[PDB]
Structure formats: structure tokens, C-alpha cells
Amino acid sequence: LWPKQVRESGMEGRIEVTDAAILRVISEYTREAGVRGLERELGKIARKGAKFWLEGAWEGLRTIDASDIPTY
Amino acid sequence: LGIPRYRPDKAETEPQVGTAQGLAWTPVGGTLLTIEVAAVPGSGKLSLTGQLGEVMKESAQAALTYLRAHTQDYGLPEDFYNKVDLHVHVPDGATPKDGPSAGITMATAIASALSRRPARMDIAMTGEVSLRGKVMPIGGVKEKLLAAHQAGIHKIVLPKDNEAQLEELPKEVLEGLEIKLVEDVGEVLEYLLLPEP
Amino acid sequence: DTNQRESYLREQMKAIQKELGGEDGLSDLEALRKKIEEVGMPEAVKTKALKELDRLERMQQGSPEATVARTYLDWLTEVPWSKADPEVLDINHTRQVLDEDHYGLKDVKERILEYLAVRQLTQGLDVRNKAPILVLVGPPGVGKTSLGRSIARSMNRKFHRISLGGVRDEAEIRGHRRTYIGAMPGKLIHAMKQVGVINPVILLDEIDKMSSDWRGDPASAMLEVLDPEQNNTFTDHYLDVPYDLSKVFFITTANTLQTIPRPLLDRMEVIEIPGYTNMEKQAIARQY
Amino acid sequence: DTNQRESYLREQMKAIQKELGGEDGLSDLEALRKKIEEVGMPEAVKTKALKELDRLERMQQGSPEATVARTY
Amino acid sequence: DTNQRESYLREQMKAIQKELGGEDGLSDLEALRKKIEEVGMPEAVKTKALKELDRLERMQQGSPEATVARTY
Amino acid sequence: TSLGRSIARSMNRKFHRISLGGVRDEAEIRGHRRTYIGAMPGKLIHAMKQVGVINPVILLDEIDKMSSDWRG
Amino acid sequence: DTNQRESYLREQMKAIQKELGGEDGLSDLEALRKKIEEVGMPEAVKTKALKELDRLERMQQGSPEATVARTY
Ligand SMILES: Nc1ncnc2c1ncn2[C@@H]1O[C@H](COP(=O)(O)OP(=O)(O)OP(O)(O)=S)[C@@H](O)[C@H]1O
């Protein structure tokens, strides 16, 4: 899904992702008994990644963390 | 302009006994569904009045279950529920937002009857009641907020459990507001009536 | 011999057409047949344009085709095919434009900047087209034309507005049965005609107040235009060659989060705009 | 005299209109036909394809007689 | 015979509306060329007056486009 | 009636209460469709003829129960 | 002789719709008619069938006199 949704929203995949957050994503951010809202939350990953990497870049090659899940 | 088509301010609109400020989000505009319920000795049969549907009646009984858990808060005897037949009008008796977002407002109308004492106006409420008498987080928080402040209402009632959505609110909006946050149905219903019993 | 033959044919049908109709249907036949060429045309539109001229040249003084086909030719020419303004893909230009547009709920603006931060990235033709429609939900009267037009001037396209308050048929999302006069396209086509490009921006307002209880279902017909590979293939009953409509930015004001259809409750991001605060509106009026 | 001249000139403009309508409309029903025989259709299927080929040869620029047959 | 006697009968209706028929679109015919100059000097009404000047010139009882140009 | 007469003569203009409520089409309002037979003047243009200037005062009478035969 | 008389006039007018006039749906109603006159029905059936054959032979555009009659 992260290769899928990150490749489908214009981005090459220049920024990356961990999994200690994605367990917190599926536990705290989509309480559906399916996977579609996980795809939506990964959409918003792509969105906020494109913004905070495009409105001014604190780093050029980053990776999203479980410590900044609320931040993202 | 002409004659003022409304009041100068919704800060004072004569706080009545049984007026419950309905913070729904209607299609065209955001309204105050100021619904009413009046208390009377009766038979216990909850009167399904004012175009009630399926979830509204059980929301009313959800209110009275919590009230039956908490009779002392609202001036209520132990066996009052078997001798009250409460009537209600719902403008848009079919739900506009298709949800009981005015569920605690329906509860407020019931208890504002059952106190026979003023539920204060001008401070508008929204949220869903629970069988355990708790305020469940409400989808679409800011719509209810600024529906109220669109009607100039300063003080808005919203779930405690949506303190999470509180920080995401814009920092030019709450400065004219104050959002007292409630997690159960008791403290919301206790604040919006000054004489709760 | 052959080019003089075809030249004589064209000039003689033009001449005897002008001599017997109402100056070619109130100058309008030759007006549209030279307004075909000043607009850039796709080739199917040239073929259809000749057909519209044919349904008009069979009678420019007799059957309603003298008027409906004339208006059909007007629709083809008035809607500028193969015509696109040099838009500007930009972000902080838009940030300062939504600064000069007044205060705003301002939550919306980061959803906007969010969307357009995706719209700078490179997969595909311009950017790869997997996005919600970013539906505005709320009342009337809040700045669903203000920030809409502010975004329009921020990215430099043709703003317009098309309310959809209760369209009963596909026949006002398409045309009516364009064999009789009175058949007219939808107001969507009226707007797309009225803007001078192929590829403007838009507000879509009042979709939750739609009503559909007949054979032609406009909800399907507005699936036929909201979906991106479809408006470039969408065609009226009035028109016969699909318009190049697919490169569009598109916001949408609904007013109910519920009564909007579930096959259009996909592909959407709930932009909750309620009313403003007192102070917001006071300064809105007070300095704009 | 007025009605006969109106009708005769109406006659030539209709006739050379049919000329021009046949001249500008081409290579679409042939697109239908080369789409017929590119598809491995059975005999009943092919003779109904011929049935809606014969449902063509009508007025087609905005007329319901054969345009729905063309889309068909 | 019913159809063509109807056609020739309304043709004599047109002819008696034309020779001995003074009350027709020919009644206002003199007022037209009398008042083309009282149309305004702005281009909006002057252009439409001059384009109806020639479109009107046909017969005002039987010709179709001449009646709309006549009334307009 | 006398109301609007006093309006236009108070504004030194020509009042013309015109029949627009109960017109079968856009035919006494927007005029009947052109290039062929079946047309009558618009009552707005009746009043615009009936005033002599670029600046009148024109009634639109009884617009409450409007209906029209044009699809529009 | 009378029934065959009305029938001879029937296939004559069905033929008239058969060369031209939308080719009668490539003799669409004729199949219903020949199936009426082939399969041996009761006579109340045959009378309402013949009067619906008379009720046929009309416009074919979502109308009650031809399409639901074809179903019928
Ligand atoms: N928040 C605002 N700040 C500044 N100007 C505004 C704002 N809202 C509206 N305007 C201006 O007022 C115009 C329309 O005002 P509105 O009352 O918002 O009407 P409207 O927005 O078109 O109704 P909706 O909400 O779009 S259905 C806009 O085009 C702006 O010029």
C-alpha cells in the first residue's frame, strides 16, 4: 500500500516510512475492520509528506517515525 | 437598513425552562433547533411526538436511563419515570444531518422539562448521549462550534474525548469562544441548567 | 480543374445560401462558420461542425434546425476547443493570495496547500490523478466563492459558479433531445461555453439539493463528469463530440454531508466550513 | 409564383445539402464495420451485426435514426 | 385532394390578403421604411435594424422568415 | 396601473403596463423564435417602442404565476 | 374474403412501412403479426391481436402504441 499510494500521488517515493508508526496507525487512526481507511491514512501520509517536504525542507531524505505520528 | 429582522444579540434571548439549543448542521445554514419538552405527571408512556423516528425515541430512552441512574441531579423521584408522558416537537423531525448530534440536546429538552427550572439559553450544546450516560466523540466538531458562533453563541458544549480535535482547531476561532468539554452526559446536563433540579 | 470545381461548389452554396435565407440566418451561419476556424478545433469537432452546419444548411429559414442547429453551431464555436491559458503551478503565491483574501477558517487553506503540494510532484502527464475532489460542506454565504475565486486568481484560471439546486434530468447535465428547438444543454455547458478556454477552475455549489426521479438520472450524469477520464469523453445530448474537459481543478460545495449520493461520497475530503466567528466576519466586511 | 420559387429553391438547397452531408461524413460506419469483423463473432451474432448495419444508412448528424445504431 | 385543396384554398387566402388585403404585414410596411431612421445611433439597435431591413423584404403573410423579421 | 403611470410620469417617462403574466412561451417577453413563421412582438419591446427613448419605466405585470412552453 | 381483404391491405401497408419509414424496425412488428397468424390462438386473443395490429404501425420512440405493444 505504501508503494501503491506513495507512487499514485505524483511522488516518486523520495521520502520513506517505518512500521512502529504504522502499527500505531492501524490501531489509533483507522478503526475499521477493513484496509481501505488504512489506504486513506496512507494518502494523508503522502499529503503531509509532500507539504512538510515542500513548504520548506528540514531534511532532504527523511523517514516518518512513531514519535511524530500526531505531528503527521 | 430597516427594522432589525432578528435580535441585536443572541447573548440574551430570555433563558426559558425547557428550551434546548439544537446545534445541528442543517443543509442550508447552521441552525439552533430550539426544541421543547414539558414535564407533567402521567403514565410512564414516552410519547413519540414531533415526528420521531427510530433512533430518536431510543435516544430519549437513553436519556431517561441515564436520568434514572441520576434522578437526584434533576429533581427527580425514584419512580417518576412510570408517571411521566413527555411530549416534544422536533422541527425537522426527520434528521437533517442523519445523526443524533442533538442527542444530548434531546436529553437537555427532557431534563429541562423534568426540572421545571431554567435551562439557560444562549449557550448552545451538541453531542451524542450513551446508555452509560457518557458524551461520545462527535464527527464534525467545528461545524457545530461555528454554527453556534454563527448565531453569535459564545459558549459551546462538545465532548471531552474530542480534546484531540481541540488543538487542530484554528487559532482565530476559539478566542471568541470557550468550549467546556464533557465526557459523560451528567456534567453537560448539569451545566446548561443553572437550577438543575 | 478539380480545385476550381470545389471552389465553385463552396462559393455557390454560400452565395445561394445567403441569397435566400435570412442573410444566412441573421448573419449567424457565416459568423459561426468563420468562428469555427478562429477557434482551434479537434478534427472530430470539424467533422461535427460541418454536420451542425449541414443540419443548419438543410433549412436556415424553415424547420427549428434553422435556429437549434444555428445555436448548436454557436455552442460548438462559443465553447473554445483546443484553447488553454498559460496557467501557473505555484504554492506560496497562493499562500499570499489566501492571505490577501480575508481571514478565513484557515484550516481549509492547509488542505488546499496539502492538495497542491501533491500537485507539484511528477508522475505521469502532469501529476498522477489519484485525489479526492476536496468537497466543501457547510452553509451558503460563507466564502465558497471567496476562497474559491481566491484560489482561482492564485493559480490564474477562469473562475465561474454553477449551482445545481435540483436538476431533475441528465438533460440538464447533457442536452435535451436535440432534434427540436427548445432543446438546450445544461448550465454546466453554459459555463464551460462562457469561459474562454478548455481548462478552467470552478466552484460546484449546492449538489445535496439535487433531485432525480426519472429515466435520466443526473447523479450518474455527474459521475460522468466528476470522474477524470470521463469529462473528456462526456458529451451532451445537445453535443456530439466530447469536449476536452479532463485537465481540471475542481472544488465542490455540497451543503449536506448525508443526502449527497454515496457513489459521489467516494473521492472526497470533508472540508468542514461552518460560519465564521463574529470578529472574522466583522473584519471581512470592514476591509473588503 | 412565390410558393413555387420558394419550394424549388428549397429543393436545390435540400439536395446539395444532402450532397454536403454525404461529403463531410465518412469513416465512422466503416470504423463500426472493421470493428465487426475484427471480433470473432458467431453466425447469429454476425447477422445481428449486419442487422444494425442495415439499421444505419439514415440521417446521422443529430438524428436518432442511426446515431444510436452507430453507438450500438 | 383534401390536402391539396386545403393548400390552394389557403393560397387564395394569402392572395386575397395581398391584392385586396390592406390589413396584413403590408399595412406596417410603409411604417418600417418610415421609421428605420428613428432607430438609435448606437450600434446595438442600429445593426439589428439594418439586418432586419433586408430580411423583411419578402412576403409578410406566407414566407416564414419574413414574418419574424416583419414583427421584429 | 395608475401607480405605475404616476411612477413614469413622475420620472417624466412613459408607463406601459404590459401583458407578461400568462404568456404561453417567451413570446411576448423574449419574442418568439426566429428564422421562421409564428412570431409576435415582445410586450417588453411593445413598451420599448411605446416609449421614445433610451430611458423608460416599464411594468412587468403579474409575474406570480409564470409559465412558458419553451424548455426554459 | 373480408378477413383476407383486411389482411391483404395489412401486408400492403406493412410493406409500405417495410421499404421506407424506418424499414418497420426491419419488419419488427411483422414478426409479431406473422406469429399471430401462425400459432393457433383463441379468437378473443385473435380479435385483440388484430386490433392491436391496428393499434400498432405508429411512432416507435417510447410510446404506448408500439413498444409495449411489441411486448404485448
Ligand atoms: N470570508 C470571506 N472573506 C472575504 N470576502 C468574502 C468572504 N466570503 C465571501 N466574500 C466575498 O463575498 C462574495 C460572496 O459572498 P458569500 O456570502 O460568501 O456568497 P457565497 O460564498 O457565494 O455563498 P456560498 O457560501 O459560496 S454558497 C465572494 O465572492 C467574496 O467577494
Numbering used by the authors:
A (entry chain C): 506 to 577
B (entry chain D): 578 to 774
C (entry chain D): 218 to 505
D (entry chain C), E (entry chain E), G (entry chain B): 218 to 289
F (entry chain E): 362 to 433
Q: What is the paper's account of this structure, in its own sentences?
A:
To study the structure in the substrate-free state with ATPγS, we first set out to identify MtaLon with a point mutation in the N-terminal LH domain to eliminate substrate binding while preserving the native sequence of the AAA+ and the protease domains. Using a fluorescence polarization (FP) assay, we found that MtaLon-Y224S, which carries a mutation of the entry-gate residue Tyr224 to Ser19, does not interact with fluorescein isothiocyanate (FITC)-labeled casein. We conducted cryo-EM analysis on MtaLon-Y224S incubated with 5 mM of ATPγS (MtaLon-Y224S:ATPγS). Unexpectedly, both MtaLon-Y224S:ATPγS and wild-type MtaLon, whether with ADP or lacking nucleotide, predominantly formed left-handed spiral pentamers or spiral hexamers, rather than closed-ring hexamers. Surprisingly, the pentameric form consistently emerged as the most prevalent class. The pentameric assembly forms a left-handed open-spiral structure. The open-spiral pentamer forms a large gap between the protomers Ob1 and Ob5. The pentamer forms a tensegrity helix triangle (THT), consisting of three overlapping LHs from Ob1, Ob3, and Ob5, forming an interlocked, letter A-shaped structure that tethers together five protomers.
The Lon protease is a AAA+ protein found in prokaryotes, archaea, and eukaryotic organelles. Lon is involved in cellular protein homeostasis by degrading damaged or misfolded abnormal proteins, which prevents these unwanted protein species from forming toxic aggregates. Lon is known to form a homohexamer; each protomer is composed of multiple domains, including an N-terminal substrate-binding globular domain (NGD), a long-helix domain (LH), a three-helix bundle (3H), a AAA+ ATPase module, and a protease domain. We show here, using cryo-electron microscopy (cryo-EM), that the activation process of the Lon AAA+ protease may involve a pentameric assembly and a substrate-dependent incorporation of the sixth protomer to form the substrate-pore-loop contacts seen in the translocating state.
